[PDB]
Amino acid sequence: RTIGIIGAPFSKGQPRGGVEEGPTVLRKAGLLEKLKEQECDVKDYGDLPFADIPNDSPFQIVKNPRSVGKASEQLAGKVAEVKKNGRISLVLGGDHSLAIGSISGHARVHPDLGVIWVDAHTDINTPLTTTSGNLHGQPVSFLLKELKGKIPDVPGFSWVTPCISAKDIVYIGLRDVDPGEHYILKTLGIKYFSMTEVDRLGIGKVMEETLSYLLGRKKRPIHLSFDVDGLDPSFTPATGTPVVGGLTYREGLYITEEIYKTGLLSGLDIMEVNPSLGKTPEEVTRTVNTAVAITLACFGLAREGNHKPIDYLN
Amino acid sequence: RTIGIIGAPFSKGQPRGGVEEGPTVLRKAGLLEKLKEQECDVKDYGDLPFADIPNDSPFQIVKNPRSVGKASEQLAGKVAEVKKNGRISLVLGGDHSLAIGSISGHARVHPDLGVIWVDAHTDINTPLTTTSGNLHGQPVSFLLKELKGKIPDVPGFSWVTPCISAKDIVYIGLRDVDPGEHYILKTLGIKYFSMTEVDRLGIGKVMEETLSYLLGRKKRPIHLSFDVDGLDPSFTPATGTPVVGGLTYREGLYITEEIYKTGLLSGLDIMEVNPSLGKTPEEVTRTVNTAVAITLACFGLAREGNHKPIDYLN
Amino acid sequence: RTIGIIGAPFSKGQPRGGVEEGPTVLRKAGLLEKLKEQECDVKDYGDLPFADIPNDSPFQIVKNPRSVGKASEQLAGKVAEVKKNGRISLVLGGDHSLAIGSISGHARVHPDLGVIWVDAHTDINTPLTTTSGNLHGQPVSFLLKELKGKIPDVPGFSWVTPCISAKDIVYIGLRDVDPGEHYILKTLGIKYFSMTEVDRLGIGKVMEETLSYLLGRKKRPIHLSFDVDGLDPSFTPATGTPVVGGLTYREGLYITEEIYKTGLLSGLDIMEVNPSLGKTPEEVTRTVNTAVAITLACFGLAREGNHKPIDYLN
């Protein structure tokens, strides 16, 4: 599979700053190399140079709006470019607010994309339902068409135009959803598989149904926004908003292995990896190594094994 | 759901004493508050004042019979009272021998109840099959009608009258059952799902079958006797009789989430939490926090989320 | 079930030496006793006295060929003897290269055996496809009939004669397979359940299908070659080639519990336990205790419980 790597060192979507080191630690772990070690065509577009917006006071409760809004705007253009070059966008991110730019830029070139959101949270709070004001918990609200006329003109987001409909997304791993968010899920009829559904059905059926839900009508590009906190913090401890009872390492790999096999992956986000939050050096490497493993499965690494189209017995 | 909290600081059903701190640590963790934070009507009936029975020598092999027998007798009356007030009894316990009083008091008001026992053990040894003599491993033997005329007149239990039939109970999580106990399971035909069945079927099917088994005929009040050692000790380490290979945090929450949804929960027991046995302070908080989470799911907290009957988008 | 214990203190199939202590630590953990505590007829044939072959230089890339080849030859004779005495061979091993001798000796007496290989690896590299040269990653290549004329005359293995066909074996737990190995799996059509299939189907269905695959045609003796690294290193850390995302303790016990119930277990291998590799004393006891538990389930220990054909209520 041919990838286009985009480093997105941004954190203003939430409090803790260490998340901007994500692209750094991931590359350092040998991500580019390992992808190449696989049948992958990799082009590194570098880390986006996000500038400091000194004058960025809160919009009502919303924090760092201009900073977050600009970073996604910049990211949107980069993703559209990589997509225009026939490459799967791989956004090594900071906080999940960048999904606004990633999914948006992706949709410019492929307006018919389906989104799969693996997270412990729905991140669908509106600037008016959020309680923390952190924009990494509001990305989905800006992207939904049905929520248009429900989001205030937030400084820094005028360039945004809702690109996905409530029926074009599936959540997997949910276990910490606010009341307002829950009301939105049920009101717009968004399809989700919280940890309760994973326990009931098994990750296998969850993926069967998820892929059926988005590809039944017809094949369409797939955007996978993966938040490392979707997995249990026993696997990805170095993250800002960990919630117990998460997806396992295996379930994480199963999900991505199944997405890969569709041959329809078009955009990928690996978010919220924050080294600065590992209680120990090992917790950092455990988080980074797991993040890398999920990324590799997205592009073909199979646990059963891989082999070239040659005769190994000769 | 409307609850009636009963603190049961008792431990004489087994060796280690720290179990009597259970009601204390659970309340301190904010149980009442958190339940209230939910759509719950909560009435705290306090911690039962168990008096010391200085003269309580062994009955054959059975230890602290009068002490254990009196505590359950006292608990039985409290549960019957809370049930008479139209409230779900929530027994924050010490050792599982208190189930004798909890299930018994519950059955006085609702003779048609079905019991769900989540434990690593069956606790169905008779005063004559037990090898340790600890009464927390014999509660079920006193409650079964079919075992009547098989239990010796144990000092302190003359007030007991078997209230449930072998067909009115289901075990979930079994992984440490004595030979005598196993013989009783098979002879009386008790329905159970040991860890082997959970692995084979998945917790989803286990709950489907469990609820079908007890509610198929007709709807009936449900008594859930939850022992924290039913879950793996990686989740609930601060307990006296931990057995490896237990139910997971998720499975624990799945079970209770499903029970809640029946709308038939009538009595709940949260037992065997012993702070004094945590190798570290964190093992104590891990055990207590998990115990609280299971309790909250019993009364509505859903991992997918919760929202009031209002318009959050306004 | 009647067992014939064989200690196989060998390690030259790989780099780390501590694996030869396996039979020692396992016996010390009380394996013989515990089996006896069960309805088991146990005869200890002792630990095979493996002599040092000072002159054993590499055959091409293959390391310690004569040493490894002799140990399996010696083991083959012992297994055939125990099988001739109507006893289930229980090989407490060192490295997995000994499977060559175990499966081979077993097949002399029972040419129609079916093999179940629980491992994180396939160990089916040929002396010409292996990259490390360690023979514990090549055992299966020597045993397959279809690979005959594909394996070089390796010094020390002239006594070998391929005994099993590609269709007579099933892999469970795979998660680290080389390209050459993968090509062999697909070319010979070997049946396997990598970690991806376990996640998709559940261990229950995996065992249903595995047993159906090997016993559908007709009943045949079963040889279970269990490598402790098939389970996740959170359960069996003291092993030389651990791979994350492995089978759980429960899945481990489920597998063996199901094999036992077939009443067809004929040969068992408990391999790769290396005490010298536990980061701590507890990691050693965790590894050994888990190895023992898997062994006990192989011969009847059930999590639901066990009882004799007597009246426990009398």
Curated annotation (Swiss-Prot), chains A, B, C:
Instruction: Give all N6-succinyllysine modified positions.
Output: 12, 70
Q: Name one Pfam family in it.
A: Arginase
Q: Does the keyword Metal-binding apply?
A: yes
- Leading EC class: hydrolase
Cite the annotated pathway.
Answer: Nitrogen metabolism; urea cycle; L-ornithine and urea from L-arginine: step 1/1
Which residues does Mn(2+) 2 bind?
A: 119, 121, 227, 229
Name the InterPro entries on file: Arginase, Ureohydrolase, Ureohydrolase_dom_sf, Ureohydrolase_Mn_BS
Cofactor(s) needed: Mn(2+)
Biological process, per Gene Ontology: adaptive immune response; arginine catabolic process; arginine catabolic process to ornithine; defense response to protozoan; innate immune response; negative regulation of activated T cell proliferation; negative regulation of T cell proliferation; negative regulation of T-helper 2 cell cytokine production
What happens when you mutate residue 120 to V? In ARGIN; decreases erythrocyte arginase activity
Explain what the record says happens when changing residue 303 to Q. Answer: In ARGIN; 20.8% of wild-type activity
What does the note under cofactor report?
Answer: Binds 2 manganese ions per subunit.
| List of residues that carry Phosphoserine | 57, 67, 158, 212
- What does this chain do? Key element of the urea cycle converting L-arginine to urea and L-ornithine, which is further metabolized into metabolites proline and polyamides that drive collagen synthesis and bioenergetic pathways critical for cell proliferation, respectively; the urea cycle takes place primarily in the liver and, to a lesser extent, in the kidneys. Functions in L-arginine homeostasis in nonhepatic tissues characterized by the competition between nitric oxide synthase (NOS) and arginase for the available intracellular substrate arginine. Arginine metabolism is a critical regulator of innate and adaptive immune responses. Involved in an antimicrobial effector pathway in polymorphonuclear granulocytes (PMN). Upon PMN cell death is liberated from the phagolysosome and depletes arginine in the microenvironment leading to suppressed T cell and natural killer (NK) cell proliferation and cytokine secretion.
What is the protein's quaternary organization? Homotrimer. Interacts with CMTM6.
Sequence similarity = Belongs to the arginase family.
- Name assigned to this protein: Arginase-1
Tell me which species this is from.
Answer: Homo sapiens
